[PDB]
Design a protein around this ligand. Sequence first.
Ligand SMILES: *Cc1ccc(NC(C)=O)cc1
Ligand SMILES: *Cc1ccc(NC(C)=O)cc1
Ligand SMILES: [Ca+2]
Ligand SMILES: [Ca+2]
Ligand SMILES: [Cl-]
Ligand SMILES: [Cl-]
Ligand SMILES: [Mg+2]
Ligand SMILES: [Mg+2]
Lengths: 236, 236, 9, 9
Amino acid sequence: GAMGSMERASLIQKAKLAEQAERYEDMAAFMKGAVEKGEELSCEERNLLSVAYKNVVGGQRAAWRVLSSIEQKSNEEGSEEKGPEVREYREKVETELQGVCDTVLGLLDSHLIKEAGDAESRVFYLKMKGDYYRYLAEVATGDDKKRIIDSARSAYQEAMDISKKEMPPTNPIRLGLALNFSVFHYEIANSPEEAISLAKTTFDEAMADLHTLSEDSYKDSTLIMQLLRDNLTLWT
Amino acid sequence: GAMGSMERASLIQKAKLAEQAERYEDMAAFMKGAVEKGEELSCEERNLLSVAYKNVVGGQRAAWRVLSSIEQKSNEEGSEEKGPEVREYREKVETELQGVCDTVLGLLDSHLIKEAGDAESRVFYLKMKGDYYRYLAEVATGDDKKRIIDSARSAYQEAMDISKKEMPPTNPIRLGLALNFSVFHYEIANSPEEAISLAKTTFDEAMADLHTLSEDSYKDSTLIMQLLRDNLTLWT
Amino acid sequence: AGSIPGRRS
Amino acid sequence: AGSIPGRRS
Ligand SMILES: *Cc1ccc(NC(C)=O)cc1
Ligand SMILES: *Cc1ccc(NC(C)=O)cc1
Ligand SMILES: [Ca+2]
Ligand SMILES: [Ca+2]
Ligand SMILES: [Cl-]
Ligand SMILES: [Cl-]
Ligand SMILES: [Mg+2]
Ligand SMILES: [Mg+2]
């Protein structure tokens, strides 16, 4: 399957090389290969997967927004017809974005999530699942936009339920999940009060648990807590 | 030919969109399509081609250097065998870099250069030709490395001969050609004295011609003159 | 509104 | 040693 003939460990090794070379498409292809070997991923391996795809879809999203914005301007009063080109190219980028999202969601469904028993692995994958439906939701306008939104909410919510049960409030994955879910509420679900409440509660419970941490953990937790604070500053 | 069914003007329009979206691979594909329509390119169209490919090959070169450097470290005394992965991936990047260079060189040869009669078009394309052999030369180690080097030198030199005959010393294309050719001397041809002399002569003749320019031209010329000066500072 | 940058591993 | 950046059109 492109990568079916390369060793798992070589795929991982090359994923790290690709990251150092800022070759995120290669990185993604390599970790896709790795995943398709059928073995569970270690913590570090989960991060490599996540980072690879986040960079790919991130480039796609930034491009989409640029084009979507040109498109919206062109469809204004006094704007001159330029032809179908802007919409065509926006659609091409969009199609390629969706393909990537479906690919990640595919890997999560076949079979990362059902094999993830530990809180840290399961929450990590459900977070990803919520993220990749959220990215689909950003560009969605059709019969199943709401279903797409609900798919995100549902993956996020299950992640949260487990995270609240199994992880301390300062757990970086719990924190990043809550950050992202609160962005979902604000940007996707039209629920800015939910967004603000989640971010606030998350920040305060974490604050109260920092005393239990080592210096290295403290640095990990406070970094994400600062992202929660930045959002709150913007939103309030 | 992927783009054979899209209109020339749509390919150009989409190339500009791709640049705004920082989608340089698309930009390159679009201008390749444009070129393959068989009509000569305007000045602005030449720039779009040049910018598209320069960005693509630039990403490839940066990745190559990262990997080549990991590779060289790993082949040192006391360095631990990690396997063939580093070389394999360096080779993959390298192969993809060469493909892109051959593609541009292909377009220049079929048939941009032979149809370029004006000094501004001909010099522009011969400069590109020198540049893309230079990029090949950077990664070359085989039977035809010298031939690759000579191909660059020869395209650069013909560009220079025409530029000296047909353009004023402040012409941005003449200036950028001379800058790049002087990098060639320094980085590829092991001729740092040639590099320093070219850059110096170029800078001084330009200096003496600035009086003839408008404010906008003056800004164009002095910007490249500053790149000549930066190199001279580094090299002396 | 910033999500996890998650760009460097 | 800087060549034409030639990155923005
Ligand atoms: C989703 C997520 C959460 C946290 C981090 N940072 C660390 C240290 O884990 C990265 C991604
Ligand atoms: C090769 C080259 C030379 C000059 C420039 N800048 C301008 C204004 O032309 C770009 C590319
Ligand atoms: Ca398991
Ligand atoms: Ca002609
Ligand atoms: Cl298109
Ligand atoms: Cl490889
Ligand atoms: Mg094996
Ligand atoms: Mg036509």
